[PDB]
Design a protein around this ligand. Structure first.
Ligand SMILES: Nc1ncnc2c1ncn2[C@@H]1O[C@H](COP(=O)(O)O)[C@@H](O)[C@H]1O
Ligand SMILES: Nc1ncnc2c1ncn2[C@@H]1O[C@H](COP(=O)(O)O)[C@@H](O)[C@H]1O
Ligand SMILES: Nc1ncnc2c1ncn2[C@@H]1O[C@H](COP(=O)(O)O)[C@@H](O)[C@H]1O
Ligand SMILES: Nc1ncnc2c1ncn2[C@@H]1O[C@H](COP(=O)(O)O)[C@@H](O)[C@H]1O
Ligand SMILES: O=P(O)(O)OC[C@H]1O[C@](O)(CO)[C@@H](O)[C@@H]1O
Ligand SMILES: O=P(O)(O)OC[C@H]1O[C@](O)(CO)[C@@H](O)[C@@H]1O
Ligand SMILES: O=P(O)(O)OC[C@H]1O[C@](O)(CO)[C@@H](O)[C@@H]1O
Ligand SMILES: O=P(O)(O)OC[C@H]1O[C@](O)(CO)[C@@H](O)[C@@H]1O
Lengths: 337, 337, 337, 337
């Protein structure tokens, strides 16, 4: 239909999440989950921007207050997430990058959702103030057996919601569900997330490739060929621009926005790549697909891999459909016997 | 202890600049200047993070406060700097990347410093929330004639202070003056820059090379041979990892902290490089040399180039001394006559 | 029952409002309303604290941006409220202090709730930075006739929710519903309201009275007697302390917290007092009563007055039960024939 | 125009203080001091507003960062000031309301100024979110002996600068030095104090009297007669409205802006008044006289009292000159021998 009116639309994430839940006739359990996620992200954003740093540096002579050892944006971000999620009384299992084991939410606080997240992604290089972020994936528990590690082992095809929080020159939460991908910019003055982009679709063909070429020595012939074709185009066309931040969320977001292709392939050292399946690959692949792009491992789609370990790694190539395809053809070409 | 010089306490940019002024027995004109940059950076930072975006999206109606198409972060940032600077009564001429012509300060507000700045660097690419910055270089007006554009045409070697602010996961102002380089962390909560790194010195040798390889088709044989030797080390050592954000302040900063080399050479299809000399090359070079690195154009040193125009471009290479010298060797190996 | 556990309770207003709605099995219309109210308050808080003031004062040389005339925290606060409430698609009628007429929400955006509010209370004296606030009252529309001014004319006994936002040394939103009164402190860094007080009950007897004694000349004998008994106690006990800010929300909150009595009686100039019934008296009376206190006009309870005009005024006395009672007895004593 | 003196631009506290230092040909020691107060106020302001209260309430677990019973805004504020002050290398002795003894600065950080401050004024009453403040007075150490408590015992008349910060609906720093009074508005977004009111002068006569009438039973006949004449004007004029927050900085500030008179006289049950001389009475008096008001104890002028102890109390009356003189008349009318 055609909506005709005197309409002003200042749509916040909270209003959005609630309405969407109303439409779906959910019991509001997921609403509370998402609302809790939004609160965790904001708190992390604030910490990442170093609000309150003056105190570590004794502006008020740290009498003890925050205590002597480290509050590593790394672990702090973890605790903020697990804590905020458990208090939502909506998650039964949590799987985090920082935790060796899947955390089973106390019986008193259990829900029917499983969240796989990466508290602070790209953190290893925070010293140079590179854009870092949070990645999250949510599955609905598919059983009646006591929630165990096993419930997290579901292909990304089974995710009910997924997305990320980019703490770049500004903070953004990109949320993707069955209905589509939407971007929300955080107005830090009022602590609200404003819908700035609705139904985000990725360009069919982009003009930028993203890969850490320092590994060129260990790249497989399919990758080495694609890359060569990006720099020296055989139709004598314009070459692709290159750009690689070293932080997945930042690279993936740049791909979603301007289009192109991101790759973190298998190289001889990490035969199965470096990026972990459950909390990095899946979420980004799911986003990519709802956004209209492709996300493959080179042989198969990422969302269809059935995991066997929560910390399983997996190669990944994602981005505009025409580029991802163009590379996949090369894989088929060099695939033999 | 025989220390007339203490780091157990908390030192803000404002205390720091001021102490440095007392020591230098300045009349206090440069201090009002440095204090104005501090206020400028803080203001642009807040805008970059999107504080207040709610109003633009109609949280109170986009009547005449929102309206449209007028405020472009870059233009705002330009205005803030030019304005906060004139209001210091310390500048006589200002060269801006957003202004075709040099700006001569009204005789009332006229001072003695010449300031060259790039207000919002890397802001073509801001849509994908990439880290951006602001770059500045300050010369002492060395003349007696009515101030003019010519006062801005002094080789980088004559700078009295230079530096930049990086708006990334956090806001940081790196300031380099005659004595050395110092890094101040913005505590957004109190609007104060804290001293976290004193006398920053770059590594002799790093393990990261930064360049836009999308242009590999148009690099000179020296650059080409260099990149090659990094990926495929002849002495069988471990290859150099690659990283490229596409934002000067961000790459330069990564280079300063982790070491390595950043290059933006004379790429065919733009023979004089792309980065501008006065407000991009010179400041980063000044910082670099102050941190113990090198900043070469391939043939000569960046800071010694005599500008012929305020908007002049130049190719540039900077970073750890061992890496920058290594490429220089290759540069000699390939031509002269 | 007895809840026994490993429980951490970081209860935000959003989580609270949602859960309470879940219990009540509401369609979530009121949830969205309350969520929208929370967003309006935060935005007002931010503006009241003068965030961004540097721009009115040309820090970036107001090129036009916010435009030439006034953005009176007074009217701005109004627009923020009406706008945010209409966009919730949950209100059919709004009654504000700043508006002569009851605003009938567009058909496309109607809901079944009526909100009577005071955008910025105590605003007349903002110049001296006195604590100001927002007062709101919510009724459910009791009919099928097209929502008209008439739907706002319901005794305070009919309110479904009521409360206020105090922008004092910190911001607090006191929310009262059928189930009780709760206080939420705003952590401005993350823009969230934290439950800091649960089921707030007022002291039976307080030791502070609040009244503008400058009107002593026009006070009725009942008031004049009570006041005299507060200063010179006939049992030679300790006199009451006095305190009157001149801003209703600030006075009422101090009464709720420490206990005592607040009075804004009828004096010969305003035979029916100054405080308006629908958006000041009712809300505060409702809060007071759920909190365990009393709120009378001197003759009858405020919550039971059936209004005849939306801008009707009404005398008011509220506070601890023992004090309010002690004064009411005096009224009965001097009430004759 | 013949103005070597402009107000069309934006003036921050930092630019202001610094200009004032150049003019006064200061060595720059008092400027580092005033710059330290500025940083101090900003830090306490942020804390007062409760930025970060989430962590205390377990948003990331109250492990050891929260724990308990240690941080009391007043104690924190005390620490911040003492600490930020010592770190200026401009103070030799500090008198604090929270410290039984005067604090002598380590010879390393030792300067020449004596600072008397009340860190969190009106903070017994902070529970009800009443506006609070910080008061400061600065003397030049006029002696040669090893600095001691005695340097703080100088009559108010010897102050070089005095002022206060009010944490109310917004944060304001009012600063009064030899030339006059100036009001700086804190733009919390950029952490900068903006000059909004220059050369503040109080009204000759105002229409508001401020006093705690709960004590009317113990006022001397002069105060009693005065209050009476305000409520029941003998010349049949309109009565004086009353207002009393119970927070010095707040009442004093209301008095400065709207005019009128503030009184806290020698109330039986505390014969020397309640307000302390060094850090409450003297600063407000200094400001007052600088704004064109009067500050009397009833018999003598507050600023001329020679202190005998740093924690000495004194009765005080201040405000518009016509009102303060009027009570003084009544004070003469009632006694001498
Ligand atoms: N925005 C949303 N909020 C809540 N439920 C949603 C939302 N969008 C879709 N739904 C669906 O509602 C289902 C019911 O889950 P629940 O509320 O836990 O009983 C969810 O699992 C989702 O599939
Ligand atoms: N923080 C500082 N403030 C003022 N001048 C300084 C500072 N640090 C070093 N200087 C030197 O002192 C000279 C004095 O210049 P001016 O303040 O205008 O009188 C400057 O040009 C600098 O070379
Ligand atoms: N926190 C709350 N959120 C929503 N509904 C509530 C809440 N507390 C009580 N309820 C009741 O649920 C009723 C249903 O209204 P509605 O959701 O508009 O259909 C409301 O009018 C309230 O009486
Ligand atoms: N903003 C200012 N900074 C420094 N001194 C000032 C200022 N305004 C006035 N003065 C006067 O200058 C004297 C110089 O003291 P000092 O800075 O320590 O050398 C101070 O004691 C004041 O009386
Ligand atoms: O720069 P490299 O060595 O190619 O790997 C960095 C990658 O590792 C991660 O930190 C996590 O696996 C990603 O954010 C990032 O893309
Ligand atoms: O995409 P390109 O052409 O390689 O350019 C990015 C370069 O230009 C700039 O974006 C100029 O703003 C620099 O920050 C950066 O080094
Ligand atoms: O100080 P007065 O004259 O007694 O009246 C002030 C009253 O008016 C109001 O501004 C609104 O009616 C209240 O906030 C306040 O209590
Ligand atoms: O309630 P009282 O005894 O009248 O005192 C309030 C007075 O004491 C103080 O609260 C001291 O902090 C002052 O701010 C104020 O003027």
């Amino acid at each position: 239909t055609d909506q005709a009116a005197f309409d002003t639309n200042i749509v916040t994430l909270t209003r959005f999440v609630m309405e969407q839940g109303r439409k779906a006739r959910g019991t509001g359990e997921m609403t509370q989950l998402l609302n809790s996620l939004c609160t965790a992200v904001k708190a992390i954003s604030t910490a990442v921007r170093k609000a309150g740093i003056a105190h570590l540096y004794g502006i008020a002579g740290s009498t003890n207050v925050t205590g002597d050892q480290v509050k590593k944006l790394d672990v702090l971000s973890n605790d903020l997430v697990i804590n905020v999620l458990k208090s939502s009384f909506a998650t039964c299992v949590l799987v985090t990058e920082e935790d060796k084991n899947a955390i089973i939410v106390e019986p008193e606080k259990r829900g029917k959702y499983v969240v796989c997240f990466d508290p602070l992604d790209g953190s290893s290089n925070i010293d140079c103030l590179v854009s870092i972020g949070t990645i999250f994936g949510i599955y609905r528990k598919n059983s009646t057996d006591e929630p165990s590690e096993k419930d997290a082992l579901q292909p990304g095809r089974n995710l009910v919601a997924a997305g990320y929080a980019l703490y770049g020159s500004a903070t953004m939460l990109v949320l993707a569900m069955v209905n589509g991908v939407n971007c929300f910019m955080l107005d830090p003055a009022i602590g609200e997330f404003i819908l700035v982009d609705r139904n985000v679709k990725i360009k069919k063909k982009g003009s930028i490739y993203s890969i850490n070429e320092g590994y060129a020595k260990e790249f497989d012939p399919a990758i080495t060929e694609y890359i060569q074709r990006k720099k020296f185009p055989p139709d004598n066309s314009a070459p692709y621009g290159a750009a690689y931040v070293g932080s997945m969320v930042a690279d993936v977001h740049r791909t979603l926005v301007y289009g192109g292709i991101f790759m973190y392939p298998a190289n001889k050292k990490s035969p199965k790549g470096k990026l972990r399946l459950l909390y990095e690959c899946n979420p980004m692949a799911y986003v990519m697909e709802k956004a209209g792009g492709l996300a493959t491992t080179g042989k198969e789609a990422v969302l269809d891999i059935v995991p066997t370990d929560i910390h399983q790694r997996a190669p990944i190539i994602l981005g505009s459909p025409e580029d991802v395809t163009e590379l996949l053809e090369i894989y088929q070409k060099h695939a033999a016997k």
